[PDB]
């Protein structure tokens, strides 16, 4: 109930002559394949990205996607001639396909976005247009659903080969999906936009996996202006996240930032604002503040 596999294809069309299509493939937070337009061949980004398939079966899977990539390019270009001059270039199309996997349970999906709006999915047997999708797409969906062959193979690719593959992939990269990287935290402070206040900032970086807990605390009392940040990625497949708290100036002392994470056991990290440790960390990162926000 906790792992999701996504083939993200992004395809760009600029004029009647210029196209490119680049895909990436995620398993959880972990990127697992890359394929750029200028590469004839899919590329592994983990040593286990072939999953549990043999080379004869992987290379066949590969060979079909290569046929698909080239045909999808002509098809979209033909659909643009079909709709001319209603829709025209530049045109951007995104496919998201794969399977989330519950505990032998699968649900599979294939979703298309036209100029950044989700518009069409494959469901059951055919491509169908979603609620709120523009009426003019009706005809293109009529012509693509005439192709019974592609409907037969997409049906195979979602109902059977996706789970099949991804279960092998789940066993093949166990130790990486369960890898535990310890977070570390530091403190900093900024002017609040409210006159007289300060925004305290508990930085937290370097944790894997993604679940984490960060609260500004006054003793036993979770401070409830604690604003959690967005998760931001590091280049080493660890995560980064800050939590802020807007205090009045002078009200900092006694506040601590607490972090709970899987990789610590129960030995939570705690930074007390006024502590000697913070003071030493602070004078190693002084600077002239030129070009601050």
């Amino acid at each position: 109930k906790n792992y999701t596999f996504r083939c993200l294809q992004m395809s760009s069309f600029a004029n009647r002559s210029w196209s490119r299509t680049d895909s990436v493939v995620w398993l959880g937070d972990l990127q697992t394949h890359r394929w750029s337009n200028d590469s004839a061949t899919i590329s592994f980004t983990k040593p286990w990205s072939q999953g549990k398939l043999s080379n004869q079966q992987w290379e066949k899977l590969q060979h079909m996607f290569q046929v698909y990539r080239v045909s999808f390019t002509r098809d979209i270009q033909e659909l643009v001639k079909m709709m001319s001059p209603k829709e025209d270039y530049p045109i951007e199309i995104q496919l998201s396909a794969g399977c989330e996997m519950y505990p032998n349970a699968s649900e599979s999906f294939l979703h298309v976005a036209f100029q950044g709006k989700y518009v069409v999915r494959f469901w059951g047997t055919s491509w169908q247009t979603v609620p709120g999708a523009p009426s003019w797409l009706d005809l293109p969906i009529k012509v693509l659903n005439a192709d019974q062959g592609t409907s037969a193979t997409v049906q195979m690719l979602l109902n059977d080969t996706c789970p099949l593959f991804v279960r092998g992939l789940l066993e093949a990269g166990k130790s990486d999906l369960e890898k535990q990287e310890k977070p570390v935290a530091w403190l900093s402070s900024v002017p609040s936009s409210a006159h007289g206040h300060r925004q305290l900032v508990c930085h937290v970086s370097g944790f894997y996996p993604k679940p984490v807990w960060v609260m500004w605390m006054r003793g036993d009392q979770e401070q409830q202006g604690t604003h959690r940040g967005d998760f931001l990625p590091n280049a080493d497949e660890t995560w980064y996240l800050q939590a802020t708290l807007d205090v009045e100036a002078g009200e900092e002392a006694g506040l601590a930032c607490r972090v709970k994470h899987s990789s610590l056991g129960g030995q939570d990290i705690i930074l007390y604002w006024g502590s000697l440790h913070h003071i030493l960390d602070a004078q190693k990162m002084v600077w002239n503040h030129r070009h601050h926000h």
Partner: T-cell receptor
Amino acid sequence: TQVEQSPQSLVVRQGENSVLQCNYSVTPDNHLRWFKQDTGKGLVSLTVLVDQKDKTSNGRYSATLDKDAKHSTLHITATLLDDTATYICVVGDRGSALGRLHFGAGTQLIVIP
Amino acid sequence: AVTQSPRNKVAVTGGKVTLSCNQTNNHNNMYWYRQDTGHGLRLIHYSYGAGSTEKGDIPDGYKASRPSQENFSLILELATPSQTSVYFCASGDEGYTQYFGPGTRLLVLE
């Protein structure tokens, strides 16, 4: 150049069978149609195969398609003399109007009495 | 049924030659080919509906034209003896099947 028929010309004696071959390199290979064309006339379809390994039939005409070898054969059982024509092999690369058709240059059938 | 017009034409090099094609099937999609000993049919122009004309593989020498759903015209604004040929029309709906007309024999002489 991407659909190729063979023999280029075939003569047979009336009443016997005759076999006509189509080899192609179209990708992707969705379906294979066979046409009969009398001189001056147009194109009468005879049969169309679509599966990966297919046999069809219309009366005295029967055809195989093996998409693995990208190869089809058209068999005429007991040729009549009306049967002399060019037989044309056509491959369409989609299962829909987005497809392009790919035409053989034909084979010339000559039935002699 | 798909019909063509004229069905035999003698043109002179340099002249404008118009080949009409008419279809009463309500097919959005129409096609023009030519046939020449040695190759099969080669696609010249096509069309996905009224107002649309699109180049095929060998369009040089021809303009196309689709004023209505039912009529599709191959224009030779400057006739060449390279364009002596048999010219076939076809139409189709969304499906993969194209329905061919009876042909048109055109000779362009000096």
